[PDB]
Symmetry: D2
Subunit: 497 residues, 4 copies
């Protein structure tokens, strides 16, 4: 619950321009893949500008271009082999919509009474509109506030009956049809995953190499394990990333985080379920709790979201990305319409530059001590050795922490302590090398199995030099055997003769 991040901003960093390669940044970028952001040329353009994880939802599109979207990613990877992309699938989850209307548009007047019925075939008007949530009367109570069309109107519940509720319109607006609805401070009793979603996961998501499931509208730890149950050993290697989008998720965040492999701060329902002035508290709290537990967090950030002119970001967009990095997020995220419809590459480019600037101003010594003093006394041998690699790297100004890991556990322990240098994770597991992209500062390279540790080390050293991640005269940290008995930390200096 207690938070801190130490920045050290100099006049020199403000004036001297940055020419560091965008992909060397520690913060990773989740980019939602839209219609235009799919030309194999453009995904490569998006890779060069700093995308690390591809995000998609099967809410729209075909089954034809859903997998036409896959192979275009899978071939975009082959045109840039030094970049291993994560694949995240966003579930639809529970969702509440209004019904259809006689005029297909009504002008609800402030102070008027509005009936909400559960018969979804009822064609409504300004006096009575259908709601897709059949259990709406059994969930809300008199005094509860119902939001319609992204909170365009708020309705206070006056009466609850078996098949309908009666509300008072609190503000006058004009509504379309099939608009979204929100029930602040009310638990939605809908199945966490659909039967469409379940087979989209079990038979199409997992065979195509999907690594993350962003579970929409997670409200309890049960929802997480219910999902993990039905994925089975067929999907035992996929990371479940609950999306906290309402009060229920925030109330139970600790136990949801316990069952989770990460957290995603989605741009969407949370803006309507919580007052806007309290959202920034939730974002900062969730990032802190994820940082302390070593769990990765993805934070939605606005960037060229609305442009009625040319693509130059607003000041609030810049500080939103910068402060999310300073708050301690592993990934910043470009959402669907935030690619601007037309400028996805320019948006991720600016985001990468902001991440580099925010990363360069961090006092990593102070950040490390802050983490150490916030984590409990009984840490394991594995965590202590991972701790020692980070502190040794900072003291000697090492260029890399090379972590040998097969399940990714070693690299996650190191990333928990936020080193200033890149964590070069070496794995023989294809599932591991595309699951660790969600952690800040971790760059993975697949290696063969049944190889001596020392051979894998200097082979990583050679390709680190090839990728300009380390030069001659540098020191790098090598850490392996974390599983033991074999927990080990080495310093080796880059030479060649």
């Amino acid at each position: 619950a207690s938070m801190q991040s130490a920045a050290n901003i100099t006049l020199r960093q403000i004036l001297e321009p940055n020419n560091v390669n965008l992909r060397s940044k520690k913060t990773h970028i989740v980019c939602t893949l839209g219609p235009a952001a799919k030309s194999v040329e453009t995904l490569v353009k998006l890779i060069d500008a700093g995308m690390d994880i591809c995000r998609f939802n099967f809410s729209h599109g075909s089954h034809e271009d859903h997998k036409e979207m896959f192979n275009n990613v899978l071939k975009a990877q082959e045109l840039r082999p030094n970049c291993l992309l994560g694949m995240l699938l966003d579930t639809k989850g529970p969702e509440i919509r209004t019904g259809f209307l006689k005029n297909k548009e009504v002008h609800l007047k402030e102070g008027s009474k509005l009936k909400l019925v559960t018969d979804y075939e009822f064609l409504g008007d300004e006096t009575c509109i259908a709601c897709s949530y059949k259990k709406l009367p059994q969930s809300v109570k008199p005094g509860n506030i119902i939001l319609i069309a992204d909170g365009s109107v708020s309705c206070k519940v006056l009466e609850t009956h078996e098949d309908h509720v009666i509300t008072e319109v609190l503000n006058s607006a004009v509504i379309g049809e099939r608009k979204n609805m929100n029930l602040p401070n009310v638990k939605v009793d809908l199945p966490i995953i659909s039967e469409k979603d379940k087979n989209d996961i079990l038979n199409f998501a997992i065979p195509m190499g999907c690594n993350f499931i962003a579970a929409s509208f997670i409200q309890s730890a049960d929802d997480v394990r219910l999902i993990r149950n039905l994925l089975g050993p067929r999907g035992r290697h996929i990371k479940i990333i609950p999306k906290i989008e309402n009060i229920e998720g925030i109330i139970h965040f600790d136990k949801i985080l316990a069952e989770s492999d990460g957290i995603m701060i989605a741009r969407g329902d949370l803006g309507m379920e919580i007052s806007p002035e309290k959202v920034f508290l939730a974002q900062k709290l969730m990032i802190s709790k994820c940082n302390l537990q070593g769990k990765p967090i993805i934070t939605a950030t606005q960037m060229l979201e609305s442009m009625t002119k040319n693509p130059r970001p607003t000041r609030a967009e810049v500080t939103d990305v910068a402060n999310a990095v300073l708050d301690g997020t592993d990934c910043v995220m470009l959402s669907g319409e935030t690619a601007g419809g037309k400028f996805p590459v320019e948006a991720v480019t600016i985001m990468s530059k902001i991440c580099l600037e925010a990363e360069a101003c961090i006092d990593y010594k102070l950040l490390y001590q802050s983490l150490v003093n916030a984590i409990e006394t009984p840490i394991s041998v594995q965590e202590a050795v991972a701790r020692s690699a980070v502190e040794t790297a900072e003291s000697i100004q090492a260029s890399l922490i090379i972590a040998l890991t097969e399940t990714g556990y070693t690299a996650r322990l190191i990333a928990k302590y936020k080193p200033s240098c890149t964590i070069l994770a070496l794995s023989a597991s294809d599932s591991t090398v595309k699951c660790l992209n969600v952690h800040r500062g971790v760059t993975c390279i697949k290696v063969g199995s049944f190889q001596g540790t020392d051979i894998v080390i200097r082979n990583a050293i050679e390709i680190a030099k090839q990728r300009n991640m380390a030069k001659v005269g540098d020191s790098v940290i090598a850490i392996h055997g974390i599983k033991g008995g074999t927990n080990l930390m080495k310093v080796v200096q880059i030479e060649l003769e």
Copy 2:
């Protein structure tokens, strides 16, 4: 240059709603007064929602409604006497504009050559456009970048001649006429204050009770003292607030701040003179340097800036205001078009709620020690006593620090250490009670002169109880004699019998 702010966010603060009165917040709100935000009813509505300082520029309007704007403020004050409003005048300062065009619109093509001439009567086209800055050739050099129409196009200087320069258009766009221009990393050689501005200040601003002069485009300490020179003893009591809007101001910020009474982070030129990814560094650095020197800072924050739908703020708008408060700003500011054209009261209302939430999450003990460890060893008797009032107030959880001051110096020393409670400043100087609103947490009340200190204290105590600033059983800190020999700090408990 080193920065830190300690937040303590709890789940309870996220869930429990805030019903604290908006005007009890510590962060103050500078609200730019526009056309519609002038109904005496609406300024009172703006006062209730949390305005503390009124901002205006004489760029537009008449001389008739400029003072029709004054008395409407001066009578809005009389309808809410517990709120003493500051009055800030924004100067126009140096300003660079393009010329007029034959078509009054040109489509400059990327890669084409564009001549910029100093003959402002020249009616231009896509090959040659006039620039109002007559000394443009003598200021920019080959390689300098010239921005037109809020950075809609960027032109690299290829040739400089006596009366014109030749540039290469770097991106294709369509321009209007009389559009603004920016010269990044180039000092603009224009008079800091006009002769229109000078007489707007000396003969209309100072007789109407203007307290702050926001000097646009301050580039050096000379600009500040040149302004202070020409205001004379007629305006010796007005605070000069330089606006840092380009690289030159940032380069010389320390010496500009030395000659200043405060700083204003304006929404405008700084977005074009500095790369967007580096603006957040400048904002945070300037706030830190102002905090360490005890100088107030006003930060522009976006809130309901663009609405093509109903007035609900974006997430980036919320975090922008919240993080500006957490960064340590004395005032957040609503700019002209950010009142939304139509929703100024709702914007300041949300801002006040955000300030209250951000203020309530601050760890004031940690913040106090952070300030103390960053300020130099040789502090004066006056600062030490002001320091003692803040620490005593936190330890005993006092409700108020009552500061008796005539020049405002005592209250500024206390505000420098950011107490968790309100600073109730008592002054006999009308100039002082409307100059201290720019400091965070300071609320002023005018008192009569030639009054015993003890009588002024309990009289402030009584009206503090009347304004719900303190109740029976509370402790308050009384601090006076700061000028001596007379530097004094008292604790008194609120009783009545």
Copy 3:
């Protein structure tokens, strides 16, 4: 239980000699008054060398020279009026002695059996010796160790019977008669105060102006309140200083300290009741617990204790005094035979110089923060204001903290936070001005009653200048009204015109 003290030792302090007046030291000296250390000339000599409290026990001497000792002190005071001496009476308390012997000397052999009988008239030998403690069989158990003649022999209890116990001699030595005895880890069931002691207190100690009662062999909080009970309102103003001399006192130290006005670390029984290697832990722990509670502590320190040559102290004697000051003792003490028989003035002189050196090396800023972080969150208005005086004095380098107090409570709160400067306590109570000498750094001056606070302040200022405690250009802290409502802290600068 946690301890810390920050020293800052420079090469300059090691080389440059100290010429500061000995009586300006902050650590005070308790000096036991012996036979030769009683010439009115020598007590004045002892005053000049740094005595602050006179210690005596009525174990020996007459009733004639017991009060002949008083008036010689009371007239030694009149020859040096700037020094108000405290008067401490040491009670005898429980005490255990062996019996008389046929040869009046026995050679107990290691491994032999030794009977200890309760019949004190029995004239003993190497097989059976009487013990004055009649309840010895009911207190010790088989396995308990009995010490004789300052631990010259140790006897393990083998048998306990009604009127005797049987022990095995563990080491061979030769014993006199009427030698002391100790029962480690066994509670002694003897009355805490005698009927001789009780009337020595109620009818001779309190009428002669005795301020402190050093209660020998305190084992429980009951012993303290049993003493305080029988002193009554006739002695309600005398400070009870328990002497912790065995395991029982250490076990119950917290509750003994709660009922106490201070603690005395006596040189004596504690060396035999606890293993020597564990005594330094007890001394440091008790000093820390007294420091945290604001209770004064007196620590016995060796200095010219054994001299078979001329009076130059050993290195262990020097570090013992120096580390006791660094551990945080309010007073260091010269015991009876430690005056060397012949050199009391030289011993207190060296002690004063050691205290000055140890005091000058303390980092008072670090010490203050260490105290503040160890004391609980809910401190009172009085303690917070006393806290503010100490911190203000350090920040502005004030020469004095002038505390106006009648019960001494104000000065004790200030002394709890160990300021680097002298605490000048002003009281109208004769009992208060001679009770506060036990606190470190507090120098008292008696003032008249019914005087305005401001008049008392500058009158103390004038005599502070007369005593070279403050000069022109100095700042001093004035603190009064601590009782309210009236809690107040002032800074005044020393001028005269």
Copy 4:
């Protein structure tokens, strides 16, 4: 110059007795070998009680029993092979003595004039005494103080002539003949090493396996390198330990420490060259400077020094040893006559118990951070890895830090950071395994050369279990390759199957 040591004393440690083996202590004991402390039975008795380094001076004795003293040590080692003893030779160095007297005793009277002549054959009286220092007139000046017979008399220099000086006796005492002399604040111009000492070193000290040379009366860095020069490659592996015994050594301590392998605080001349009240400052400063540089320090501590009764230590003796350990000394030392003449084994036994108690109360986490924050930013790879072993050992509560080193450099880097557990140093160099005993907490075991690192590790593990230094279920730290490229830190858990 800044000092700190964090103690955590509990009531439980005061009451619960210690049964830990004495040789498992971290502080090591230098014991001066005297006449009686030489029975092969008694040196073994001294080993069991905690001796780690044997100290001797060739000032007395024969050449026959000087080496009869060696082989008795060398065979005492063979009766306890788990204890490798260091051998320290104390040089005589510069030394100043009075002459012979007609009565062989004079009563110098305070105020009388005393001539000191350089003709050492002159048989003197109370008017004129010879001094062995021939250059005495050229070293002291009028106003200098000359000390005779352990400071029994002090003489202020009144006149300096070619072959004599005239002094005024400042105190009356009776002197023997050939008594020592001291010249406070005056550099003694005598050869640092004699020709007797030089051949005692080059032809008898180094062939017998002497490891440390305690150079008496070191006054400059030149003295250290002049000694190291004349030892040559024949003694390149011997550690030179300057003895700082006068003002000159303290003035130049930093540069003396730079050329040194350690420091010894000798009991002797320093008590006369510096005022007693300033000696504790010098001891604490020198220990701090040695701690920060990683250089070992030996501190003389009093223990059963004077006993006119049975051997129970005084309180000042106990705190002297305990505070020396808390100050941060690597070794405490029993000097010649401090073995009591009769009780050397009992004195070292009590010292070991005191060291164990003082060591057990140290807060090692706080001590480690204190060291880290006092050492400069640019530390090497070797020091960083040694740092990581200590912090990892504390976090996981490892039982041992096993250091593989041949020159001892690895173990010294680890000992610099004062781990709570034993440092088990493994070396193939006989010179290294008997030089590292001077560092706190380092226990050496000789191993064969040309052995794989992993084989040496678990072999040390097995004999660690045999010596009760580690049990099953423990974690130990293994650190090797510190020379590279090969700097390495491992954690291994103790199992056996």
